[PDB]
Amino acid sequence: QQIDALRTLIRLGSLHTPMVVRTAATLRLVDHILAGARTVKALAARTDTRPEALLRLIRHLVAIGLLEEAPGEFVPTEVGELLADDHPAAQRAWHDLTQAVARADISFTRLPDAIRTGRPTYESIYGKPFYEDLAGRPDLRASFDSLLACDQDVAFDAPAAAYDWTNVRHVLDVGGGKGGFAAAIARRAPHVSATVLEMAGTVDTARSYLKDEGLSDRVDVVEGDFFEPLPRKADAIILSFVLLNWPDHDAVRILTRCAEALEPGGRILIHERDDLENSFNEQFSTELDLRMLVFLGGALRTREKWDGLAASAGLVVEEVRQLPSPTIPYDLSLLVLAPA
């Protein structure tokens, strides 16, 4: 039993395996193989790497079962195929060290400082805090928006169906990304108009995305800062995966700006985790919660915490709806908040 406990511990503690996975995604190793380069010299050329070092990386990729080896010819496994760039779960991009998230994940190398201080480590590594770093790096800004929106044609169908749009005229989507939630509601409730509030760079991609859905006459995009007064009032105000980016004091500020922008009868809709789930759900949550810590100083929140957050902003949680996810099996929640 000790040999077994020992193998398990060494596996769990190993840094080399996820960096090998991320290296392979970054070099688009699987895409090139699927595009014919099954040999070492050809793969090394396409990835622009040394053939002997590439071979040493490939060896571990075989050991963990992402690839398998005719002699000197390698093919992806079923698991390996998920690193193809056109796979629906987009795992290649999520593991790509040149794109925003896997890049930010380096913050985990300073996890002890984060546990010691409760403060994010991203800045100590990259020179500026997360959104400020992206603000100065249009490549990262763009890749971040594409990752979060990787699923946007379907990801917002369930939450949009979980709210009654009958007496809503206007929706404001605060930090709404490329506008996917706004678009989903528009398709569902054609009498509804919307505004998306977003940061520089992102607003241009939102405008394009919405124009390409044919929604340009129904959803506006405004460039702004949701710590400042909101650009207009609305019957529903949406915060989809925004509040987990912020520590309690900032999250209360954001909620306060939303409450002040609400029309009479209006509601604020928080789309996130109502944090609790099973053994596979639990590791998504622990990973996302710790990401928020090291990237941003944010956190996932239980219902008891939402209740306190709501009250501090003069709000109350009116109801909570649990929602299935379509591309990755994870349970999400829509919280509906009303003035207290």
Ligand X SMILES: Nc1ncnc2c1ncn2[C@@H]1O[C@H](CSCC[C@H](N)C(=O)O)[C@@H](O)[C@H]1O
Ligand Y SMILES: CC[C@@]1(O)C[C@H](O[C@H]2C[C@H](N(C)C)[C@H](O)[C@H](C)O2)c2c(cc3c(c2O)C(=O)c2c(O)cccc2C3=O)[C@H]1C(=O)OC
Would you list which residues are annotated within the binding site?
A: 141, 151, 175, 198, 225-226, 240, 245, 291
Query: Which of a copy of itself, ligand Y, ligand X, none does 330 bind, CB closer than 5 to 8 A by kind?
Result: ligand Y
Q: Which residues are annotated as a binding site for S-adenosyl-L-methionine?
A: 141, 175, 198, 225-226, 240
b/e for 69-80, b at 16 or more Cβ within 10 A? eeeeebebeeeb
Q: How many CB atoms lie within 10 A of CB 182?
A: 32
Report which DSSP code applies to 13.
T
What are the distances in angstroms from CA 179 to CA 10, 237, 258?
Answer: 43, 13, 18
Residues lying near ligand Y in the complex (CB under 6 A): 101, 148, 150-151, 155, 241, 245, 284, 287-288, 291, 295, 327-328, 330
Q: At a CB cut-off of 8 Å and minimum separation 6, what does 10 contact?
A: none
Note whether 77 and 67 are within 8 A (CB).
yes
Smaller CB separation from ligand X, 76 or 179:
179
Note whether 238 and 289 are within 8 A (CB).
no
C-beta of 287: minimal distance to ligand X in Å? Answer: 16
Chain center to CA of 102: 11
Query: Which of a copy of itself, ligand X, ligand Y, none does 19 bind, CB closer than 5 to 8 A by kind?
Result: a copy of itself
Smaller CB separation from a copy of itself, 217 or 282:
282
C-beta of 335: minimal distance to ligand X in Å? Answer: 14
Query: Which of ligand Y, a copy of itself, ligand X, none does 227 bind, CB closer than 5 to 8 A by kind?
Result: ligand X
Smaller CB separation from ligand Y, 270 or 288:
288
Residues lying near ligand X in the complex (CB under 6 A): 131, 148-149, 175-177, 181, 197-199, 202, 225-227, 240-242, 245
- Beta-strand (E) ranges in 19-143? 67-68, 75-76
Q: Which residues are annotated as a binding site for substrate?
A: 151, 245, 291
